[PDB]
């Protein structure tokens, strides 16, 4: 049944008339064949002859439905809506799919405004960075996940050989629901700039090329020189770090008699306020799908506009189909949906729990509380994580056998995966110790972490940035599009990236680098291949070998985790600059 104006994610329209039996709006043969031919000719009456120069050529719905349901025989000026969408309105078939998304879902200049390229069935709106570069029959399609945000949105990566051409959303009705952010799709050009392709050895104020045999030998002569004692070996994990490399680095430092392992975050409290002891203390226990059935949601120190754009659109969708009321505590911001602001600190949050907000949350069938990723980096994390936890434990509806009402929302993908493998030191005795050997496993948030002038610093990563500048020896790594990696999102779901292309230059898989360095440092890990590496993962957490599966925490155990917990600034200053891949993007510079 052909259509141009039907899409179940949007409102119903009858301005295309291709579904005649309009069956889209109507609830529940030669005339119909003739009708489809007659309607098809009308669209092609004014359509420009642009198929050779038009980016929708091999993937055009107007072409395919002209062939399938039509006969074989038979001037509007362009506009500018940003440097991301190329507009050729001559080809528009006047189907109003752009209007429904831009006003109902987007709420708009937006973090989701680039999704209109997918909905436009014709070449009226097309990706501008992708313009003129490839045809859909040239592209190899690879199903992987996003690591630009903690959501783990399922994306489709189209590669033409070595190059990565474009990123498209792929269906998943549990995390992203057919949408991705503009960061998720227009940062792929950073994978072709500032790439780490050769081992670089620092000799003074310069870097020179090096072999893997030397770059793993200079570290050995650097590790045996500074001679870090027990807890002087500091290992740091960044935002875009896979799980197979976090565990390999965790075991490498342990075999050197060290436990000083951490992330690139700046949480003042060394044991994170949520704590990594229990899974339920730091995951979206309610799961993203059950945000639909929400009654009252409490946003605590979070900005879903920037922390997780795709999930933010889920909140607006429920806000329109029902009478959902969402109460937000913290710094004010422009929102795509109505929010009742309460305050910009924790006094209001406690006072809100003693006000009308708490009464609704008590009698709500399915209450929700969302704590931001930047809350742990703020001073009153202990205040919030005890105020909310006491509220969670004191009431019954928040923790029920059928519903769990506590959810922590992160922004960086490597966080939850690191927590599950216990990659966060739980002591200030270990943390405050001076470091002599520093291993930057893809960490570039070091503007706040101490780096001693005499400490031996090694940067392993897939891009050249500030973190690579501080290094003494640089080891090139592979980006997520190039490695069969494992990432755990904020809800505790294990998802594995699938390798689409090889790493550039002489770069290696991120965990194979650490294992090889172990043999040079006498701490030879027992790992020999990925299957043996993933068997070790089950020895750190049994659920990690269960792809696309959320392991819900038992109700009884999660209660103790909630109990033991007893200015909210937005963590993101610039949306277009979050990870290293976005910084090297030339397209994101145009957005700036």
């Amino acid at each position: 049944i052909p259509r141009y104006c039907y899409h179940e994610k949007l409102a119903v329209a009858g301005n295309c008339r291709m579904c005649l039996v309009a069956s889209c709006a109507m609830p529940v043969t030669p005339k119909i064949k003739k009708a489809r031919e007659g309607v098809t000719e009308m669209l092609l009456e004014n359509h420009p002859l642009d198929c050779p120069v038009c980016d929708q050529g091999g993937e055009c719905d107007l072409q395919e439905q002209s062939l399938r349901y039509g006969s074989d025989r038979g001037a509007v000026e362009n506009k500018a809506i940003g440097p991301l969408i190329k507009t050729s309105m001559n080809r528009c078939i006047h189907c109003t799919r752009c209007v429904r998304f831009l006003n109902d879902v987007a709420g708009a200049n937006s973090e989701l405004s680039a999704n209109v390229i997918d909905l436009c069935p014709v070449g009226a709106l097309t990706s501008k960075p992708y313009a003129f570069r490839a045809r859909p029959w040239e592209l190899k399609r690879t199903e992987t996940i996003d690591v630009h945000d903690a959501l783990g949105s399922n994306v489709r990566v189209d590669t033409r050989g070595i190059e990565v051409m474009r990123v498209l959303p792929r269906l998943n009705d549990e995390i992203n629901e057919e949408w991705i952010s503009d960061k998720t799709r227009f940062a792929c050009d950073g994978l072709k700039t500032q790439r780490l392709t050769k081992p670089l050895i620092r000799q003074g104020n310069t870097f020179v090329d090096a072999t893997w045999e030397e770059a793993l030998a200079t570290i050995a002569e650097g590790f045996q020189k500074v001679q870090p004692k027990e807890n002087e070996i500091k290992a740091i994990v960044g935002s875009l770090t896979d799980l197979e490399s976090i565990v390999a680095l965790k075991d490498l430092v342990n075999k050197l008699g060290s436990e000083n392992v951490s992330t690139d975050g700046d949480a003042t409290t060394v044991p994170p306020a949520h704590g990594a002891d229990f899974r339920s203390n730091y995951i979206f226990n309610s799961t993203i799908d059950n945000i639909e059935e929400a009654d009252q949601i409490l946003l605590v120190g979070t900005n879903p506009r920037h922390e997780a754009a795709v999930l933010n659109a889920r909140i607006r969708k429920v806000w329109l189909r029902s009478d959902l009321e969402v109460h937000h505590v913290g710094e004010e911001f422009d929102s795509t949906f109505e929010l009742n602001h309460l305050g910009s600190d924790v006094n209001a949050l406690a006072k809100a729990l003693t006000g009308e907000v708490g009464k609704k949350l008590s009698e709500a069938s399915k209450p929700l509380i969302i704590i931001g990723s930047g809350v742990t980096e703020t001073q009153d994390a202990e205040a919030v994580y005890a105020t909310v936890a006491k509220f969670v434990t004191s009431n019954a509806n928040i923790v029920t056998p059928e519903w769990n009402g506590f959810n922590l929302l992160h922004r960086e993908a490597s966080r939850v995966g690191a927590l599950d493998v216990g990659f966060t030191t739980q002591s200030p005795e270990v943390a405050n110790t001076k470091a002599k050997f520093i291993y930057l496993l893809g960490a570039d948030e070091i503007v706040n972490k101490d780096i001693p002038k005499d400490a031996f610093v090694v940067y392993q990563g897939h891009h050249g940035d500030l973190g690579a500048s501080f290094a003494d020896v640089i080891l090139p790594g592979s980006a997520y599009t190039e490695k069969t990696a494992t990432y755990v999102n904020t809800e505790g779901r294990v998802q594995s990236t699938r390798a689409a292309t090889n790493p550039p230059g002489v770069a290696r898989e991120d965990w194979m680098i650490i294992r090889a360095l172990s043999e040079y440092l006498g701490a030879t890990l027992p790992y020999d291949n990925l299957y043996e590496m993933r068997s070790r993962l089950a020895d750190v957490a049994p659920h990690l070998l269960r792809h696309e599966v959320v392991e819900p925490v038992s109700e009884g155990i999660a209660k103790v985790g909630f109990q033991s917990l007893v200015l909210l600034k937005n963590p993101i200053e610039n949306f277009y600059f979050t990870d290293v891949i976005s910084k090297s993007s030339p397209t994101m510079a145009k957005c700036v």
Binding site: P48, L49, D50, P52, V53, A75, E77, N78, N90
Partner: protein
Amino acid sequence: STKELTTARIKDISKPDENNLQQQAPNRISPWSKSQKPRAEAQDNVRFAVKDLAKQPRPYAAIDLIYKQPIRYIEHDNVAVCDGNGGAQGHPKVYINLDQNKAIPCGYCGLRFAQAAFKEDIES
């Protein structure tokens, strides 16, 4: 200078000497596309060691030739029609809107059409 030979620019900053074999084209000095390999770097290979560079194929750059054509001007109309000036041997016929105050090139030929009432502004 090696900068006008290995970088992509809208217009050349100096006069193209057609006897200079390091130019990207005999009429243009710098490459006209970002992914296009500079001609100077291409010829610095083992296979060019004992070859005569002058006899290698050097077609003139189309980017320099297409913009020497005068802007077409339409009288008493807001739409320009182009079909390659060859009919069945040109390109597919397209209609070009002239609402804006600028010269809009053809999607196939590159001929830049404009309205006669906008002539003075565009020439400025």
